């Protein structure tokens, strides 16, 4: 099916959505999903999925760095949640020539986008507490 679509002008979107068996190793998964990734033009991955693929522990250590004596920016003076933007070099282990766009999502809170020539983040929000008795995040 992928091949037939490309013949007729199609563009392929791989929304990963990893299943339970595939969360065991980074190595077993990278191999199983490889052919699909390289035949894909637009890809969506979650924040937890992207880190799983590359250096998950390294990212975890980073978010728990609290500076010892003085803060380096006024931002670190304020104790707020982390919203790291992954630099383009970090994602280079996973780029290929036919990738037009890559989206990494952190809930509805942040959406990061990566393109062959540009990068960035779109700010968002979430208010599940406005309706406390009818809230489900399922879809």
């Amino acid at each position: 099916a992928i091949s037939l679509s490309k013949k007729f002008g199609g563009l392929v979107f791989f929304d990963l959505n990893l299943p339970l068996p595939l969360w065991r190793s980074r190595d077993e998964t990278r191999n199983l999903i490889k052919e699909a990734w390289e035949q894909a033009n637009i890809i969506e991955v979650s924040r937890q999925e992207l880190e799983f693929l590359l250096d998950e522990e390294h990212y975890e250590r980073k978010r728990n760095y609290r500076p010892q004596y003085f803060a380096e920016n006024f931002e670190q003076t304020k104790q707020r949640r982390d919203y790291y933007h992954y630099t383009p070099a970090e994602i280079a282990p996973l780029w290929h020539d036919g990738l037009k766009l890559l989206f990494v999502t952190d809930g509805t809170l942040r959406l990061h986008y990566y393109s062959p020539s540009f990068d960035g983040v779109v700010v968002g929000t979430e208010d599940v507490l406005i309706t406390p008795f009818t809230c489900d995040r399922t879809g």
């Binding site: 500076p67 010892q68 004596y69 003085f70 920016n73 006024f74 670190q76 003076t77 304020k78």
Partner: peptide, 28 residues
């Protein structure tokens, strides 16, 4: 006092031991 309280505002942009003194004959 900690980091939450103090911050670095500005990013912006021959020497050694000469010796030890010798005691003195003329103390006065």
């Amino acid at each position: 006092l900690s980091a939450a309280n103090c911050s670095r505002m500005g990013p912006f942009k021959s020497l050694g031991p000469l010796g030890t003194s010798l005691p003195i004959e003329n103390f006065y």
